[PDB]
Design an enzyme around this catalytic site. Structure first.
Site, short mmCIF file in Angstrom:
data_model
loop_
_atom_site.label_atom_id
_atom_site.label_comp_id
_atom_site.label_asym_id
_atom_site.label_seq_id
_atom_site.Cartn_x
_atom_site.Cartn_y
_atom_site.Cartn_z
N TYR A 27 -59.07 2.29 -1.45
CA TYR A 27 -58.58 1.28 -0.50
C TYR A 27 -58.69 1.57 0.98
CZ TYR A 27 -56.76 -1.39 -4.42
OH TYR A 27 -56.66 -2.19 -5.54
N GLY A 29 -60.68 1.58 3.69
CA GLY A 29 -62.00 1.13 4.07
C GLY A 29 -61.94 -0.38 3.91
N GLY A 31 -63.89 -2.19 0.98
CA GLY A 31 -64.09 -2.65 -0.39
C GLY A 31 -62.88 -3.13 -1.17
N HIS A 47 -51.02 -1.19 3.35
CA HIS A 47 -51.43 -1.72 4.64
C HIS A 47 -52.20 -3.02 4.58
CE1 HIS A 47 -53.89 -1.94 8.41
NE2 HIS A 47 -52.67 -1.78 8.91
N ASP A 48 -53.23 -3.15 3.74
CA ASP A 48 -53.86 -4.45 3.79
C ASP A 48 -53.08 -5.49 3.00
OD1 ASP A 48 -56.15 -2.86 1.86
OD2 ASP A 48 -55.61 -4.89 1.18
N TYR A 51 -51.41 -6.93 5.84
CA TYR A 51 -52.26 -7.84 6.60
C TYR A 51 -52.32 -9.16 5.83
CZ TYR A 51 -54.28 -4.68 10.22
OH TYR A 51 -54.48 -3.87 11.31
N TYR A 64 -52.33 -5.73 20.81
CA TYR A 64 -50.93 -5.65 21.11
C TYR A 64 -50.71 -4.36 21.87
CZ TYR A 64 -51.32 -2.58 17.00
OH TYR A 64 -51.74 -1.61 16.12
N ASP A 89 -49.46 -1.77 11.20
CA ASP A 89 -50.19 -0.60 11.66
C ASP A 89 -49.28 0.62 11.85
OD1 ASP A 89 -52.47 -2.15 11.62
OD2 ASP A 89 -52.57 -2.45 13.78
C1 LIG Z 1 -59.85 0.38 9.48
C2 LIG Z 1 -60.18 1.84 9.09
C3 LIG Z 1 -60.62 2.55 10.38
C4 LIG Z 1 -58.92 2.51 8.42
C5 LIG Z 1 -58.28 1.48 7.50
C6 LIG Z 1 -57.05 1.73 6.67
C7 LIG Z 1 -56.95 0.34 6.04
C8 LIG Z 1 -55.82 0.03 5.09
O1 LIG Z 1 -56.03 -1.33 4.71
#
Ligand SMILES: CC(C)CCCCCO
Ligand SMILES: CC(C)CCCCCO
Lengths: 121, 121
Positions: A27, A29, A31, A47-48, A51, A64, A89
């Site tokens: 996760y 990244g 994909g 985290h996503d 989002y 922000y 974040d």
């Molecule tokens: C966006 C990259 C740099 C790091 C991502 C962590 C994402 C968790 O959804």
């Protein structure tokens, strides 16, 4: 925006968002598939999902402002979006730090076929 | 599925599943070691033991249907799995609200690290 998210990441972990957290597990990244493989991978999964609750905003780019207060990350005030995006974040970066302990290089560039379940949020 | 669970939680507690519960104490969010920090945390523990007793089902993913009658959560009939999962989720959610008055920000984003050892669920 990712420009702020990447800054918190480098601050809290010392690692650059790109390699370190852009091709880690199933996760961290873009994909996004299967079941999180470890502590750090779950931070990314959460985290996503975060989002996800923000349809009316665009996290990738609205910037922000945040700052530290007694060393803690604090989201400066702004639009509801900027604030919610920042909380997503803030938590993620703190989560990457609390788990720097089990962060292993064996999960980098992890293969797609090893990402397993059906998982939604 | 987390979709039903997460918003079951907001109907009962008034809080969004993600920040409030995704990483609370030692068992909220996923995670699994340590002696539960507090009441809320004990519910995540018990909820984990509940999911754990459904080897034949995919708890985190199967969608089940439920309704609220006269303010109470009622699990509609579906498969054996959808029904047992739903009850696990209802029990956790309701517990969450019963202990809202002890909910401590002090435990959100808790260092999974500090939790050592496996309790017999
Ligand atoms: C966006 C990259 C740099 C790091 C991502 C962590 C994402 C968790 O959804
Ligand atoms: C991630 C939110 C929906 C809460 C998860 C609780 C898991 C308890 O085992």
């Amino acid at each position: 925006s990712l420009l702020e998210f990447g800054k918190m990441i480098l601050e809290e972990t010392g690692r650059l968002a790109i390699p370190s957290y852009s091709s880690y597990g199933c996760y961290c990244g873009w994909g996004g598939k299967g079941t999180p493989k470890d502590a750090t991978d779950r931070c990314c999964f959460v985290h996503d999902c975060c989002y996800g609750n923000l349809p009316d905003c665009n996290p990738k780019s609205d910037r922000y402002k945040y700052k530290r207060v007694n060393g803690a990350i604090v989201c400066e005030k702004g639009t509801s979006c900027e604030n919610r995006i920042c909380e997503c974040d803030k938590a993620a970066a703190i989560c990457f730090r609390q788990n720097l302990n089990t962060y292993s290089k064996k999960y980098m560039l992890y293969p797609d076929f090893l990402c397993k379940g059906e998982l939604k949020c």
